[PDB]
Write a protein that binds this ligand. Structure first.
Ligand SMILES: CN1C(=O)c2c(O)c(=O)ccn2N2[C@H]1CC[C@@]1(CC(F)F)CCc3ccccc3[C@@H]21
Ligand SMILES: [Mn+2]
Ligand SMILES: [Mn+2]
Length: 200
């Protein structure tokens, strides 16, 4: 069919909060969302994954990790994950430093994406249009002996995580994989997927 705009796709597919945080991040790093449109889409996707990973996961009044999908958590429930991504660098490092003071976890060399209050570890989220093992190994060769746990998602449903430790249940991860599949198929419908896949 016709070739669409990636700009139009991003503004229709992602919630306005995600699009706004992505625009803010690209301005911070000197990237124009109007030009680097495939990168804008990749930033929105990765943000959405980070939010989806955290969504519905709480620590309850007994210190137990649970799942509440109702939308209406009582105010004794703590989010299981701190979301680091989506914050300007100052606030992102302020949150990191605050977690490290609270938990005694080592301060990470590189800004991570999430912190898991159950597993007591930072998380690096990856989303790739390439083979997941290739992107896992690129992240691994960057993080080295840093204690940040790596979790990679592809658009084809493959995953790879540090030491085969996937953190979340299968249904939580399937929600993320279903969303990535939806994004890929809607990109393909608008003849965007080929440029997007090859720009990685
Ligand atoms: C600080 N950054 C990250 O936290 C990060 C990731 O967590 C990641 O998994 C992969 C790439 N990352 N990077 C870097 C640098 C800054 C960008 C965003 C900026 F252009 F607005 C560069 C492009 C880009 C594309 C997709 C997703 C995220 C990012 C960001
Ligand atoms: Mn990040
Ligand atoms: Mn990441």
């Amino acid at each position: 069919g016709p070739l669409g705009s990636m700009e139009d796709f991003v503004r229709q597919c992602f919630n306005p909060m995600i699009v706004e945080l992505a625009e803010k991040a690209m301005k911070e790093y000197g990237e124009d969302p109007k030009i680097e449109t495939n990168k804008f889409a990749a930033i929105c996707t990765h943000l959405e994954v980070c939010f989806m990973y955290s969504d519905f996961h709480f620590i309850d009044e007994r210190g137990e990790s649970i799942i509440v999908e109702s939308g209406d958590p009582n105010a004794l429930l703590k989010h299981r994950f701190e979301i680091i991504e989506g914050r300007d660098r100052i606030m992102a490092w302020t949150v990191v430093n605050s977690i490290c003071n609270t938990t005694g976890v080592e301060k990470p060399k590189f800004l991570p994406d999430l912190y898991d209050y159950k597993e007591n570890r930072f998380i690096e989220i990856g989303v790739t249009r390439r083979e997941v093992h290739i992107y896992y190994l690129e992240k691994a060769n960057k993080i080295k002996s840093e204690k940040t746990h790596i979790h990679i998602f592809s658009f084809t449903g493959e995953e790879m995580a540090t030491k085969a430790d996937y953190t979340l249940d299968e249904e939580s991860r399937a929600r993320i994989k279903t969303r990535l599949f939806t994004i890929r198929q809607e990109m393909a419908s608008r003849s965007l997927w080929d440029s997007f896949r090859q720009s990685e």
